[PDB]
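During the second half of the funding period, the structural biology subgroup turned its attention to how the target accommodates small molecules. The most pressing case was 2-acetamido-2-deoxy-beta-D-glucopyranose, which had performed well in the primary screen but for which no bound structure existed. We therefore specified the complex as follows and requested a full 3D prediction, including the ligand pose.
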Amino acid sequence: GLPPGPLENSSAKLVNDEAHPWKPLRPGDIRGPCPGLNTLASHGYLPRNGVATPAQIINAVQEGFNFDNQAAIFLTYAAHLVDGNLITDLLSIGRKTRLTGPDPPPPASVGGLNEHGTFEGDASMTRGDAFFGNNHDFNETLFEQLVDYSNRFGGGKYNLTVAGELRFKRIQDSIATNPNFSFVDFRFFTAYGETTFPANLFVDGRRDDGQLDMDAARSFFQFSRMPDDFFRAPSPRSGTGVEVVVQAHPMQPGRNVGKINSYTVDPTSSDFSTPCLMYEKFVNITVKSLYPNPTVQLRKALNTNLDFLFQGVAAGCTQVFPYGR
Ligand code: HEM
Ligand SMILES: CCCCCC/C=C\CCCCCCCC(=O)O
Ligand SMILES: *[C@@H]1O[C@H](CO)[C@@H](O)[C@H](O)[C@H]1NC(C)=O
Ligand SMILES: *[C@@H]1O[C@H](CO)[C@@H](O)[C@H](O)[C@H]1NC(C)=O
Ligand SMILES: *[C@@H]1O[C@H](CO)[C@@H](O)[C@H](O)[C@H]1NC(C)=O
Ligand SMILES: *[C@@H]1O[C@H](CO)[C@@H](O)[C@H](O)[C@H]1NC(C)=O
Ligand SMILES: *[C@@H]1O[C@H](CO)[C@@H](O)[C@H](O)[C@H]1NC(C)=O
Ligand SMILES: [Cl-]
Ligand SMILES: [Mg+2]
């Protein structure tokens, strides 16, 4: 289906309401590395089994959290192109599942949001690096480090100042311990934006003061659960304040080169000075590598989802056509 448009009414409102109660997981229900999508699934804004269409994800992030339309389109179609089934139009918000339907040929993985190095990647705040065995489950030790950083830099709340310090701490922890640490291109961009989302979208919309309390933080990050009486944000937003997080500790894109403490800058990577290059590499290298020579029906589904992705790309970038027009 076509990407949904913006909300007709973007006011703050109760989203933890009678039609969207929290429920625990049933056998087979899928949760993944994103506390936002996990919460929408666990309140029935998404299918509770954690398998959804791109149109369902965009409608859910808008309706439940007031995620802005352009950000919703960009992230949802990027995730879907690399992790979703383009023929069935289904994406797992976590593990690979037969529920997304018959797989395309390799090297396409259709691995769900849990797939390392497509969307998901290293130096997550509350999830471990894939090298350490689990890139998707809530991690109590890492959450307690978020709490400690909130206590030291946020007077006990998570805010953009905390985000700037913890983002850097998590990068330095991956450099020191993950010999395969990768922090380039799409992950370099998304890792900074994600640190703003708790301050912008998990804060009750009646306050909208960017100060997330640790009870609410644990409820979203661990239990995929809105606070009792949670109001969504009072206007559409996604990553506003990311400039504060970058400014705290500016980093160049790079990777460890098969050993700890070997962080080597990659001059072929996009960075914040080359946002259009991030889009071009994502399509020309990442998507094309999964679907190098697609059959007629896949090519058509790729071209449709690539058009939708471009709708979420900031004005002033040129659309690229890896399978022609
Ligand atoms: C619109 C579509 C969305 C997609 C496709 C998506 C996908 C993802 C993925 C794959 C990750 C894992 C990246 C990583 O840390 O390795 C992630 C992280 C995250 N997402 Fe989402 N997300 C979306 C929307 C949102 C929304 C609406 C929120 C909040 C309301 C949100 C909050 C987060 C947070 C806080 C993290 C970081 C978790 C951490 O580092 O501990 N996302 N998202
Ligand atoms: C734009 C904020 C920088 C980092 C935050 C994570 C990335 C995406 C948030 C939504 C922006 C969607 C369009 C970006 C434009 C582009 O891809 O060139
Ligand atoms: C918009 O939503 C608000 C509360 O969420 C409500 O008070 C108002 O009546 C709504 N506007 C329309 C167009 O219905
Ligand atoms: C290691 O990094 C490579 C790409 O640099 C990636 O393909 C691979 O999945 C990573 N593995 C883990 C578990 O980090
Ligand atoms: C959580 O993260 C810590 C710190 O990186 C790690 O040592 C631990 O093995 C992870 N897993 C669990 C289940 O706590
Ligand atoms: C985070 O909270 C601390 C303590 O209240 C404060 O000094 C700092 O200015 C806050 N930062 C933001 C961006 O709100
Ligand atoms: C992507 O491929 C297009 C041609 O399809 C080309 O114009 C563009 O320069 C490429 N961008 C890269 C590799 O960054
Ligand atoms: Cl919007
Ligand atoms: Mg991760």
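Two results from this model are relevant to the next phase. Residues 119 and 190 are 8 Å apart (CA to CA). The radius of gyration is 19 Å.
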